Design a protein that fits this description.
Two copies of one chain form a homodimer. Chain A has 89 residues and is mainly alpha-helical. At the A-B interface, helix 1 and helix 4 of A face helix 4 of B. The complex binds chloride ion. The PDB classes it as transcription.
Chain lengths: 89, 96
Amino acid sequence: RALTLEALRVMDAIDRRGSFAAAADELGRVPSALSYTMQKLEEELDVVLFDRSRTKFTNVGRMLLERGRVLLEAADKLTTDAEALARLE
Amino acid sequence: AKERALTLEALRVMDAIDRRGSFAAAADELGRVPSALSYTMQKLEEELDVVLFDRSRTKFTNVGRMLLERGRVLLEAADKLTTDAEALARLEHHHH
Ligand SMILES: [Cl-]
């Protein structure tokens, strides 16, 4: 869909690094790749997620940012757990 | 927060293969050609260095099954977050 783990990762990196350009540096992509992801999410959910000026998240943007970090942690834990089992097989 | 091989879409492919019983029927459900589902599965195997399906009917490996089952928990939480975000947007009378 447009809510992807990558979109949540983009949102997390923009919050942490402060801007599209700094977040794109972290993720190793060109900035337009990050804005494209965010445009598709904003258009699907039909809401503004943040305003750049550092970056300020909207109320809906902050809920996706904060609850999305819980999902990212769970995805990393699942990845870790599956690889650990795989080494035993 | 940066293990990027696993996607929710790959988990949804996994769920459809389990529910429908074959790559062919799952691909039919998802509106894709069956080899597109094979590619998504095999690219994840290669990125994670795991094997998801038994190589001796379509059967998940023990590793594939842990991703399938615990991945459904992730899918439910992603749907819940989508619903909650949409509900907040409505109470705020979001712009279209
Ligand atoms: Cl947070």
